[model samples]
Target chain A: SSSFSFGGFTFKRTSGSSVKREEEVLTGNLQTLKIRVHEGYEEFTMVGRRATAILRKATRRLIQLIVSGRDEQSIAEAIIVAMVFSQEDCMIKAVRGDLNFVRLNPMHQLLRHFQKDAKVLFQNWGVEPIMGMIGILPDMTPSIEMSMRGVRISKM
Target chain B: RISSSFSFGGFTFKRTSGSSVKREEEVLTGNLQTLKIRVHEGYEEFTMVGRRATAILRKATRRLIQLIVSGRDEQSIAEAIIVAMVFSQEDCMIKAVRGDLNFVNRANQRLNPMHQLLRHFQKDAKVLFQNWGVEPIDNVMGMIGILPDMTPSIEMSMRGVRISKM
Candidate 1:
C-alpha cells in the first residue's frame, strides 16, 4: 500500500506499479520521467509506437529548450504545435490507407470539418489568415519575350 | 404616414435626425442586453454560491449538469466543488456571527449542490478524492456553536473595556 496526503486528506493506493528510466548527464546529473499505464482493470490506450516516439522526441526537445533558456509559454506552444502536427500526419496516413476513390461523401464532409478545425487551431496559435495562391507570375527572363512588369494570370 | 417637409431657403428640411440615432442606439442596447444575459449566466455560476435557495444556484446547477452530461473531465468538476465550498464557508461564517437561524438554515443547504455533484460520480468519488488528495469534512462550527462565543465577546468589549477606560 502506498499513501499520500494533500490538504489534510489521507489517500491510499494499493499495489500500483510503474516503470522509471533515468539518464546521466556529463556533469553526473540524473533526470527521470514516470508514466502510469494501468490502475486496476482500466488500462490507458495509446495511439501507436509512433505516438510514443513523437512523445519521446518532444520531451527531449523540451528539456533542451528549457536548458537553453527558452521562455516557458513559447516552449509550451512549440511542443503543442509539434504534437498536433505529428498527430495530424498520423491520422492522414491512416485515413489514406483506408480510402476509397469512388463515392467519397462522408469522408468529404469529414475533411471539410477537419479543414475548419485546422483554421481555428491556427488562429489559436496566433497565425494570421492568408488568401491561398491564385496564380503564378508570367514568364520572367530578360531574353524571352515577356512583359516588363510581373503579370499574374488566372485560368477559368 | 408622411407628416411634413419644408423648404427653408432652397434647402430641404425634415424631422429630427435624433430619431435615427435613437433607433440605432436601441438596436445596440438590445444586442448588448442579449449578450449580458449570456454573460450573467456565467457570472451567476461563480458569484451566486454564497447564498442558499438562490436563482443563481439553480442556474449554476443547470450549467454543471450540462458539463457532467458533456463528459467534461474530472478536474473541472473538482474545481467547481472547491469554488462552491469556499463561497459557502464565507457565507456560513457571516451568518453564524449574525445570530440568525434563517441564514444558518439556508446556508446549510449549500451542501445540497455538493451532494448532487457527488451523486453524479458515485463510484468514482473515492478515486477522484484520492487523486485530488482532499477529503470533505463536516462544517467545524454551527450558528449554535458561534452564539456563545459571540455573546461573551460583544458584552465584554462593549462593557468591560469601557469600564476599564473609565
Candidate 2:
C-alpha cells in the first residue's frame, strides 16, 4: 500500500551551497538510479530547486513506465530498488539537500516528519537506511507509516 | 517397421549403469535450446532454457509458412504447430542443458509437453497484453518475408462431409 498524495506541500530545501553539497553526494554513489510512482506526488515549484529537480527526473521516468505498460508492482519494485539503494541513487539523494519535505495530508506530514528526522539523525552518524519511491505517490487516505525503499548498505 | 540399418549395442554411446542391451528408439533431431529460443521470445536468443523451445517453433513455423505459401490447406495444421511453439520455448531448457537435442522431435511427436507449456505462458502473455491493450507481434516472420497475418482458417460443412448443397 502507498502513503499520502500530493494535494498540499509547504516545505522547501535551503537554496544554497548546503543543498548543492547534498545533491553532489547523492548523485555520485548509486549503482542504479530510477524513479517511479503512481500519480499525485506532492512538491512545491515555489520552493526547493534541488528537490524539484530530483523529483521531476524521477516522475518523468515514472510517466514513461506508465506509457510502456510496465508500472506494475514488479516494475515499481525495480524502480524503487534502483532509486533508493542503487549506487547511483545514493550519490544523487545524498548530495541533494534535505529541505522540509512536503506534506499532502496532516497525518502523513506528522509521520514523515518523524521518519525523516530519524533518517537524518541516523545517517548523520553514518547509519544507512533503505526505502522506496511510493512514499511520493498520491493517496487519498494517509497510512500509519511513510516508508520508501530508499537506502542500502554493502558489507565487505 | 523393422530395418536392416538397425544395430543393437554396437557403439554404446551413452554410459548406462547396467550392462544391458537396450534398443534405442528413433533419434529426434534439431537443437532443443535453439528451438525454444525462437518460439517463446519471438526473437532469437542465446540465453538459457527458452532458446530450445524457441528454436523448435521457429523452424516449424518456417516450415509451416512454406507449406502455407505453397497453398496447403489450413486443415493440415493440427495443434502440433502451437504445441511445437510452446515446447520449444520453456521445457526445452532442461533438455538443452542435458545436451539432448533429440528430445525436441521426441517431445514434438510422442509427448504433448509443449501443449502444457504453451497453454501456461500463452495464457499469461495473452492476459497481460489484453489487460494493457497491446498485441505482441513477431518481427522475425516479417524478416522471413511471410504474409504478416498467417492465421489458419476454419470451414464448417453441413451434415455429411460434402462441399456441396445440403
Candidate 3:
C-alpha cells in the first residue's frame, strides 16, 4: 500500500522546484508566482542502512528500556514483553509480532513499467526501491532477531 | 467491616427522570473519557504502548536507583520506590490483558495471570515496602486500583481465588 517501511522512506518528493506564473488580472496588471518545495526523505546508504538502522533503533531502544530501568519488577516486565511478543517457540515471530517491524531492504530492480511519454527526470522515480539493509549475528541471515531476552540458557 | 466511610444520603433512584437526564448522560460519558486515559488502552497501544511501558518502567527504576544511591531521606527513597511499584503494577495489568500473550503460570494449581498478579502482589508488596522500612500496601490496593466495571471478576482476582480476563 505504500513505499517503504515506517522507520524510513525513499525520495517520493520531487527533487526539483516547481514554479508556475500566471496573471491574476485580465489586463495582466497583477502577476502571481506559485512555487512549491517538498523535500524527499534523506537517502539511506546502500550498505544495509535500513536494516541496521531499524534494528539499530529497536535494539538500542531495548537496552535503553533495561539499563535505564530502576527496579527488578520493571526490568522483568520489559523482559516479559520482549519474551511474550517473540513467543519463545519461534524467534522470528517475535521480530514480526510485538517488535514486528524492520526488514532490511536490498538493492534490486523492481518489476515495473513506466510511461513512454513521461519526462526522463520522472523516469527513475517510480521503478526503484528507496534502499536499506539487514542481518543476524555474523551478518546476512535473519537470525539477527535472536536477541529477545537472550539473557538465557539451558542446563544439561 | 463494621464501619463505613460515608453516611447515608438522599440515595435517590428514579428511572423516570426528565429530559435533563440527557445532559447528565453527557456528563457521565465525559468522566469516563478522562478516566480511560489512566488505563483502558489495550489495542491502541502496543509497540508504541509497549515501548512507552518500557520507558516508564525504565524511568521509575532509574529514579529508585538514584534515590537509593544518593542517600536521600527515607521518605524520598520510599516515595520513589512506591512510584516504581505503581508503574510496575499498572504496567503489569496493562500488559497482562493488552499484549497478554497468554502464558500459563503455576501448572500445579492452575493460577491465572490476574490470580498470580494479586497473589504475588500481596506477598511481595508488603515485603517490598518492608525493605524501605514501611507498612504493607495490601489494604491500599483493595480500596483503590480495582477496575470499576470489572468489579466482580477483578474482585475475584484480588481474592487470589480465580477469574476470567480483565
Candidate 4:
C-alpha cells in the first residue's frame, strides 16, 4: 500500500506510483528527501537557484493534478513529495481506510502558500486563485472525497 | 473537414465529411468495379464503443468551450479536459485499452460506419490536445487510434469474412 500525508492528514492506498522526474541533475549536491509517511518516494533536493526552480515547477504540477481530480492518491503522494523537497512543512494526523485521505487543510491555502514562493522564484507561472475560479468556496468544506461502488451480476 | 480510407481484400472504402446520407450500394463489372457500403443504425451510426467515446468527448468538449469562453486560463482548461476524459465512462475506457472494438464498433453488424466516425473523433481529439499542450495518456491514444496489437486481427477477420462471401 502507498501512503502520503498532507495538512495533518495521511492518505493511504495500495499503489504508490509517482510521476516521472528523471531529469538530469547538475547541482552542488543531490539528496533524497523523505516525508513522515509514504516512504520509497523519490524526491530529490539540491542547493541553489536551480533547485528552487525545479521545486516551483513540481509544486505547480502537483497543484494542477489535485485541481484536475486526477488520481487522488498519486497526486497526494506527489504533493507531499514536492513539499518535502521544497522544504515546506505541515502537520499530519491519523490514517484512515484502504483508500481514503484524512482531510484537506484547505487546499486553497496550500496552493496560495506555494504560489507565494513560486511567484518570486520564477516568472509568470500563471498561478492564481484557482478555487475561486472553479467556484469552490474557502468556507464550504475542509475536505471533499468521492467513491464509487459497483454491483456485480454474479455476486448478486 | 476530415476523411479516412481503409482497404480490405483489394477493396478500398472511402468516406468524406459532407456526405450524411446512409445508403449501401454495390458495383459488379466483368473485370473489376468499386463496391460501396452500410446497414444498421443507432447513436448516429456509432457502435456501442463509438457512442460512449463520442459521448465523453462531447461532454468534455462542451466543458472545454465553456472554460475557454469564460476566459479561464489555459492551465485550467487543460486540467478540465484531463478530468473529463479520464473519468467519463472509465470502465469502457479500460476495455478499449484491451483492444476491445467495443470501444468503437456497433453490435449490429461487422462493417459499420461507426469505426470510421470513431477514427475521425480520435484525429480531432489528437489535434485539440496538441494545440492545448495536453498529452493524453498512452492508452487513451489507443482508444483514438487503431490499436497496433489488434489491427492485424481485425484485418484478418474482415478479409476472411469477405473471402467466405465469395
Model 1, A1-156: lDDT tens per residue? 354432112223332343323322221012221221122211111111111111222212211111000122222232233323222222232221222335543324224333333333322322111121121111111112322111111110
| Candidate 3 structure, TM-score to reference | 0.16
Off by over 4 Å in 3: A1-156, B1-60, B65-119, B133-166
lDDT (0-100) at residue A87 of candidate 2? 23
Per-residue lDDT over B55-92 for candidate 2, one digit per residue giving the tens place of the 0 to 100 score: 11122211211111111232222222233333333232
Off by over 4 Å in 2: A1-71, A87-156, B1-166
Across A1-156, the per-residue lDDT of candidate 4 in tens digits comes to: 344444332333332235433332211122222232222333221111101111222321322212211122322333333443332222111111111123422333333344333322212112233221121111212122311111000000
Q: Report clashes for each candidate as comma-separated counts.
A: 0, 59, 8, 4
- Ranked by TM-score, the better of candidates 2 and 4 is 4
Q: Which lDDT tens digits does candidate 2 get at residues A4-117?
A: 223122123222111111111212223222322223323212111111112222321211111000113222222332233222323233432333357343223223333332
Give fnat (model 3).
0.00
Cα TM-score per model: 0.15, 0.19, 0.16, 0.19
DockQ for every prediction shown: 0.01, 0.01, 0.01, 0.01
Write down the RMSD of candidate 1 (Cα, Å). 27.5
TM-scores of the candidates, chain A only: 0.16, 0.17, 0.19, 0.22
Candidate 3 structure quality by residue, lDDT tens digits, B96-134: 231112322323235423343343333334433322222
> Which stretches of candidate 1 lie above 4 Å from their native place?
A1-96, A100-156, B1-32, B36-166
